[PDB]
Amino acid sequence: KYKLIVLDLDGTLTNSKKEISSRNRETLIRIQEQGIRLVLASGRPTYGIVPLANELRMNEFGGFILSYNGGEIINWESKEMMYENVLPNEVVPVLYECARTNHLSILTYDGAEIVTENSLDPYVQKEAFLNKMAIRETNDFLTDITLPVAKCLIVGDAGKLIPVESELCIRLQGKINVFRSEPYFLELVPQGIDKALSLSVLLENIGMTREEVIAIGDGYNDLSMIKFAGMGVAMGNAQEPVKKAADYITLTNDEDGVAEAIERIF
Numbered sequence: 001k002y003k004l005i006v007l008d009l010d011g012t013l014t015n016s017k018k019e020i021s022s023r024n025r026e027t028l029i030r031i032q033e034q035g036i037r038l039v040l041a042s043g044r045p046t047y048g049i050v051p052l053a054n055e056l057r058m059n060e061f062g063g064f065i066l067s068y069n070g071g072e073i074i075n076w077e078s079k080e081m082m083y084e085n086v087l088p089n090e091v092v093p094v095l096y097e098c099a100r101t102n103h104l105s106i107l108t109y110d111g112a113e114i115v116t117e118n119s120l121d122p123y124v125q126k127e128a129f130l131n132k133m134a135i136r137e138t139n140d141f142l143t144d145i146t147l148p149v150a151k152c153l154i155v156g157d158a159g160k161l162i163p164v165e166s167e168l169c170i171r172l173q174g175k176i177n178v179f180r181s182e183p184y185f186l187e188l189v190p191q192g193i194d195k196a197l198s199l200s201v202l203l204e205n206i207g208m209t210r211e212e213v214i215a216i217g218d219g220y221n222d223l224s225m226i227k228f229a230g231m232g233v234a235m236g237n238a239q240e241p242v243k244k245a246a247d248y249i250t251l252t253n254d255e256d257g258v259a260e261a262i263e264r265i266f
């Protein structure tokens with residue numbers, strides 16, 4: 001019946017210490033050994049998902065990474081990228097100048113590294129630590145990044161980010177979307193980002209239907225994929241609307257709710 005499992009990371013696959021429990025690891029490895037393919041889908045850049053994909057041996061089982069909320073779809077075994085929704089290059093200098101004039105740090109990604117002019121900003125380091133990515137500091141952001149980039153973050157105290165968000169929202173209407181993922185992270189992304197849309201594209205490519213998919217998540221940004229999946233699973237720690245939209249409610253992330261759901265469903 002089911003042929004694909006899609007997992008969010010934070011609040012879902014990982015526990016409160018941001019680790020994959022050995023129960024979740026062994027259950028996910030076993031289900032792949034039985035022929036089920038996995039997808040890790042998250043707002044993180046690709047290399048913030050890579051270590052978890054490696055732990056789950058996804059590079060041996062044709063696993064997919066949907067990084068940047070599905071802005072990229074990458075087969076982690078073949079390394080082939082199927083889908084690339086990235087920022088228009090012309091917006092990047094505008095984002096940089098906005099950060100500069102507001103005395104806030106901007107960062108973006110270049111493979112396994114975060115690129116920024118302020119490696120000593122605690123908010124920049126928070127993004128590096130969550131993703132386990134080294135920081136490459138530069139004194140010339142716009143010349144040292146590699147374009148195109150899938151997103152940038154402007155980071156700082158929430159109070160300082162709100163007006164920057166409110167300005168960029170309208171200034172770059174039609175070119176980007178803006179939202180805060182943590183109070184201190186302003187995400188600057190292309191239009192049309194949605195895990196469910198990217199999943200749809202993935203399914204069309206690998207010849208699966210939505211009825212054949214299990215998707216597991218916890219947050220509002222998981223709602224569309226939980227609705228889209230034939231078997232949408234809310235974590236025990238999920239938001240109430242996500243629970244109401246699900247087909248199945250599992251244990252919390254700290255109680256191995258991912259392993260539990262997979263064992264129960266299969």
Ligand code: NA
Nearest residue numbers: 008010011219
């Ligand atoms: Na989450």
